[PDB]
């Protein structure tokens, strides 16, 4: 049975609005949620993170790209609603008084896609992962205790003769080396910023369902929904309640997420291409030549012939009118599986749409991503992140008593105290609240404390912009005053 | 693009196989007839003789690398009973 | 043995008064906080005479009034402490300081704790402190190869080499006075005792420490960036 | 402020005690009644049982750290005869 009233939940985790409500009150609730999301410092941080080219011209940032993803998602949602209304299935599916929340949730999910990426993107995550992999060596805990354990932490070594504590070390060691943008985005929205969003809004940004501490093979019935980590170990309990609030089974997905994913796949191509022309790399004639060589008739021929700042404004429209109805029909056709949360495919994943998207992608890979500047920026970002982690390493070499004393107020740790004071207030408060709730008598306290210390370091590193991290890296290396 | 952790797991499996005195040969391409990408792996030894060879097809590379790593771990379990 | 010259006590006393008050004034001049916050923090961290006169007679000229009262309250106390315990100071065995339970200690501690709470915790001081540590460590690492040589090699390098280009340039980078001091110190040593290498190593390390400590902040910083090929 | 060498000596004594399979617990505060600063040290073992505990008062921290280091070395000599 399909009933969207069981999925669009307007309750909250704190000070939730209880009782009965009408359409107007629900709409006001979701407008308030939009008000909290739009006026957040995370968006203004998105304002100054690079997409492809270094920040100078009128090149695009994360924010302008998010503004295209939002538009595409809203247009697809409107097409779906119109097609459902035409077939007289809108009232039978429980969506009669929930169209506004539908569109608002899709738009806000599209706006929050890039909230949790670290500086420099794909090359920031790689650096963090390699650094922590060198420090922890998670591949040595997959089986019974060894004598050649390469871990550098005494408390995280698998010391044979104790099986209840080992399971926990394995989980922590595997989790700490799987930083991912979406899991950090969930953590940021819930724990670090404390925005208190509705359950549906939080579920709209849960893209993948694989736990970060997973070891082994995934079931054949979920191999696509579990291709990337979805959430960390510190949010597990939270996620559990989320499922109870949205009637989701284990490793399942919230319906509207599919739409958002689709949007992130269209814009991803076309926008990049345009910027290549604006930076004076090549021109329109070369665009058509490369497209024709790498190859369709309708869009390409209309764009090339009707053209003989206004070429792209004509090229987008045709692509949208060719792609959006296909996504709407794919959503409506497989609706029961999506509502169940077990659809193991994507909307746009053998039609001509795949061919056109692959054409755009391969042209972009051949003529844009191979430019020396992108490549140089990518290497520089990797080195900067590694250097920052090396600089902040001494905070992880302390002991439980020393770090605890350092948190409460020292005269014995000048360098460490200054480094700790350099961190932000919100991250330290999150650490304090996380550690306070732990039982202070179990033999599992040091493990959790080390996990939360590493989490604090990763939050600090990932909460920067490109320019801020770069400048701080040169300042801490005594290269500039 | 491909996620870093999947590549790290594949590299770890390759290193585990190589430390077992085996050779891993990797080849890849794209098949436009099936509209997918294909990866073939050929396991060998110190002498250079084929033992197990398999090819995988998929349209998304994240699933493809996971399948390859799973197969590599399965063979390692099979042939690590001894020899 | 282990005794002290009388007048030194007086000097020590001085280094203890100014140490507080001056720092506080500079905090206002760099636009960190203001007079009202000064009084609020002082009152919270706490006396009647100096503080009340300073705060009430005030309602560039506030500090000129605050100093004078503190001096007229502190200097006679130090003079009387010097005169009272004069035989012990003249003997050189007085195991205390002049200003070390009177109200003077309380006022000085008030100034010191306010300065620690509101001035030394600023991010800029902290950043400068880390940068200086790293610069000194880097300079020592750069000049390390001079300490890995041998007695014969360093002796030959001092008298004039073709076998040690990098080491010769590094040595020539040092100042003339320090090298002359090393030469005079080593010349007087007996060249036959089995203790010669020990003393020579000691004086080499002394030469390095004199060179490192004889710089200014800006000179050391600039030299550190130049030797690391970061700036031309 | 505290001189670096005194802190280094105190840290060396603490490390020597810790390598002896002992635990050193450090606490500090200020006593305005006596107008001084107080430091208490509590020695323990691998099980977490108190052995020796002492508190020192002084108005200058350089002397206080020297006294603490001297006491730590005295206990190390006492309990390093054996066990």
Please describe the structure with a list of short key phrases separated by commas or semicolons:
part of a larger assembly; 4 chains; A: 481 residues; mainly alpha; 2 strands; B: 83 residues; alpha+beta; three-stranded antiparallel sheet; 2 helices; globular
Question: What does this 3D model show about the protein?
Answer:
This is part of a larger assembly, with two copies of chain A and two copies of chain B (83 residues). With 481 residues, chain A is mainly alpha-helical. Chain A has three domains: 1-117 and 178-253, no CATH class; 118-177 and 369-481, no CATH class; 254-368, no CATH class. Chain A is built from 21 helices and two strands. Chain A has helices spanning 23-38, 41-46, 62-86, 99-111, 122-136, 164-175, 181-192, 199-203, 236-246, 257-278, 284-294, 297-306, 311-333, 335-340, 352-367, 372-392, 400-408, 414-421, 425-436, 445-462, 466-476; strands spanning 210-211, 229-231. The radius of gyration of chain A is 24 Å and the shape is globular. With 83 residues, chain B is of the alpha+beta class. Chain B has one domain (1-83). Chain B has helices at residues 4-19, 61-79; strands at 23-31, 36-44, 53-58. In chain B, strands 1-2-3 form a three-stranded antiparallel beta sheet, with helices on one face. In chain B, a hairpin with an 8-residue loop joins strand 2 and strand 3. The radius of gyration of chain B is 13 Å and the shape is globular. Chain B starts with a helix and ends with a helix. Chains in contact: A-B, A-C, A-D, C-D. Chain A binds chain B through residues 122, 125-126, 129-130, 133, 139, 177-178, 180, 217-218, 223-224, 227-229, 349-350, 354-355, and chain B through 1, 3-6, 8, 12, 16, 35, 59-60, 62-63, 66, 70. Chain C: dGTPase preferentially hydrolyzes dGTP over the other canonical NTPs. Chain C: Homotetramer.
